Design an enzyme around this catalytic site. Structure first.
Site, PDB file in Angstrom:
ATOM      1  CD  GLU A  79      -1.386  -2.498   1.753  1.00 28.01           C
ATOM      2  OE1 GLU A  79      -0.185  -2.647   2.039  1.00 28.01           O
ATOM      3  OE2 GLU A  79      -2.215  -3.435   1.878  1.00 28.01           O
ATOM      4  CG  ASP A  80       0.968   5.963  -1.426  1.00 28.49           C
ATOM      5  OD1 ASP A  80       1.957   6.290  -0.744  1.00 28.49           O
ATOM      6  OD2 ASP A  80       0.433   6.738  -2.263  1.00 28.49           O
ATOM      7  N   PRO A  81       2.475   4.264   1.587  1.00 30.84           N
ATOM      8  CG  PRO A  81       4.794   4.285   1.911  1.00 30.84           C
ATOM      9  CD  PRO A  81       3.723   3.721   0.988  1.00 30.84           C
ATOM     10  CB  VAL A  82       3.128   9.107   0.800  1.00 26.94           C
ATOM     11  CG1 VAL A  82       2.961  10.616   0.858  1.00 26.94           C
ATOM     12  CG2 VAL A  82       4.605   8.775   0.582  1.00 26.94           C
ATOM     13  CB  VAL A  84      -0.962   4.805   5.095  1.00 28.84           C
ATOM     14  CG1 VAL A  84      -1.205   4.352   6.528  1.00 28.84           C
ATOM     15  CG2 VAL A  84      -1.630   3.806   4.139  1.00 28.84           C
TER      16      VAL A  84
END
Ligand SMILES: [Ca+2]
EC number: 3.1.1.3
Lengths: 97, 219
Positions: A79-82, A84
């Protein structure tokens, strides 16, 4: 690696090439699993990470993916951590802090 | 730009994996995140605890983070901060919430080993026999990754190993006894604790998340 698998990567994932922490963290995570850690991010088990309101522990991330690392490279299933972290800052805002 | 991430209180990002040499460059640790949050209206501050080892103690990272928090508060006029920590940074954030609860509005931990790391434990065990730890391919690959994440050093081997000492099951056990939190579930339950905690006359919002990419397989 023996006894573990990395669910963050898909077949022939370029992240296994461009980000050396992908395979390194699978190896450290297998050492942890042989020491009864259970599922983990390569350095920290799901159980050890639990604190306060847990938003999720299902992200398909290794320890460096959590901080969008190395240089923003992540497996195909990660998943995209930015996004999140951004969502969480809005969550804090809506909680009045 | 917009105000999607414009919290009432400043956001302090607290790194965990750091070198032993003060003032290293930590601007890319939270890769691409500071500019993203700033574009959405957040007031972001990135702590630099490089050069400090443990979290507790007179010269630990906790007192350094506390001093940084008081600096951000004196400058902005804000009364509290939101602490978001990664790895060891989550433990450092808990120290500040315990010793200065009135300055904290929330504590969020990302990939923090509140109960320790079995990899840190493994390295402690290996070092009794191989004090450099480089005979182990798994340890050497970790060391190299650590080196790539932090600023250049002549002594990456030493610093990467140092980074794990605070994260053992034994060290964190003592830490939790010294700095209890309602956010932690009972030992050995693999469950979380409470979503909030009242410490002084201050209420803290407590949060966390973690990654589970590495799963156990039979083969
Ligand atoms: Ca990565």
């Amino acid at each position: 690696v023996v006894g573990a698998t990395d669910t963050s990567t898909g077949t022939l994932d370029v992240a296994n090439v461009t980000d050396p922490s992908t395979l390194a963290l699978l190896a450290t995570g297998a050492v942890m699993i042989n020491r009864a850690s259970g599922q983990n991010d390569g350095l920290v088990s799901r159980c050890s990470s639990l604190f306060g309101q847990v938003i999720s522990t299902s992200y398909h991330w290794n320890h460096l993916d959590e901080i969008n690392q190395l240089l923003g490279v992540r497996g195909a299933n990660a998943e995209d951590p930015v996004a999140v972290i951004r969502t969480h800052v809005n969550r804090l805002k809506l909680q009045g802090v | 730009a917009d105000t999607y991430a414009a919290t009432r209180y400043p956001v302090i990002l607290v790194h965990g994996l750091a070198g032993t040499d003060k003032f290293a460059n930590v601007v890319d640790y939270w890769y691409g995140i500071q500019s993203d949050l700033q574009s959405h209206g957040a007031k972001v501050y990135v702590a630099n605890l490089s050069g400090f080892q443990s979290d507790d103690g007179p010269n630990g990272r906790g007192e350094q983070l506390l001093a940084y928090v008081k600096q951000v508060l004196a400058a902005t006029g804000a009364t509290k901060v939101n602490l978001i920590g990664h790895s060891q940074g989550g433990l450092t954030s808990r120290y500040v919430a315990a010793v200065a609860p009135q300055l904290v509005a929330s504590v969020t931990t990302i990939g923090t080993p509140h109960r320790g790391s079995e990899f840190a434990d493994f390295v402690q065990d290996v070092l009794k026999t191989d004090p450099t730890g480089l005979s182990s391919t798994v340890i050497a690959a970790f060391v190299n990754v650590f080196g790539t994440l932090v600023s250049s050093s002549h002594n990456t081997d030493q610093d990467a190993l140092a980074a794990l000492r605070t994260l053992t099951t034994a060290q964190t056990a003592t830490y939790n006894r010294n700095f209890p939190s309602a956010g932690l579930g009972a030992p050995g339950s693999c469950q979380t604790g409470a979503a909030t905690e009242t410490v002084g006359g201050s209420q803290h919002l407590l949060y966390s998340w973690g990654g589970t990419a590495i799963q156990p397989t039979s083969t």
